[PDB]
């Protein structure tokens, strides 16, 4: 029904919000050599997935880390330097985060139009019978 559109579009609104927050944590950790949890932060990605289970909502199935190797930088005098003297920094790519930032915002706003479009159809469907 038209109410299923609200569930489908609403799921995308939450879905694009997850990717926006993941990108925000990527931009804020692009230069963080250290990290609690004994893990040099690596770029995270939200992998969307259609939950077919007509109406196909979108669900986040889990956040996946980047496969790119960490950026090694020779800083011998740093306390975190290894024997060779290289400290490692996250593999966050700025350009893809900016592209993800644009795409997530554009996709978020176009889901609002569909919810608005379905809202008007239900209101007119209610005016029938009056």
């Amino acid at each position: 029904s038209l109410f299923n559109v609200f569930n489908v579009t609403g799921s995308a609104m939450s879905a694009e919000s997850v990717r926006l927050n993941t990108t925000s944590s990527n931009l804020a950790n692009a230069d963080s050599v250290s990290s609690s949890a004994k893990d040099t932060y690596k770029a995270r990605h939200a992998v969307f997935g259609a939950e077919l289970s007509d109406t196909v909502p979108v669900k986040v199935m889990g956040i996946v880390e980047s496969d790119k190797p960490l950026s090694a930088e020779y800083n011998p005098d740093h306390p975190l330097a290894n024997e060779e003297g290289y400290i490692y920094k996250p593999n966050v790519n700025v350009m893809e985060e900016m592209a993800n930032m644009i795409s997530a915002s554009r996709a978020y706003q176009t889901n609002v139009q569909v919810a608005d479009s379905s809202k008007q159809m239900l209101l007119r469907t209610l005016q029938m019978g009056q």
């Binding site: 790519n93 350009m95 893809e96 592209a99 644009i102 795409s103």
Partner: protein
């Protein structure tokens, strides 16, 4: 994402690696017995859109 966004992003990523390659060469401008590296660019896959196959 609109495909034009990602096609342009590949060029940005490609030139980013080119800058990093150039930066290493200028860093080793006084290294004895060093050989310069150059980045080689090539076009990616070309896809038929207005055809089912």
């Amino acid at each position: 994402m609109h495909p034009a966004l990602w096609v342009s992003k590949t060029g940005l990523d490609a030139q980013q690696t080119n800058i990093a390659t150039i930066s290493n060469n200028l860093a080793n401008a006084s290294t004895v017995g060093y050989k310069k590296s150059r980045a080689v660019f090539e076009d990616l896959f070309y896809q038929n859109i207005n055809q089912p196959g």
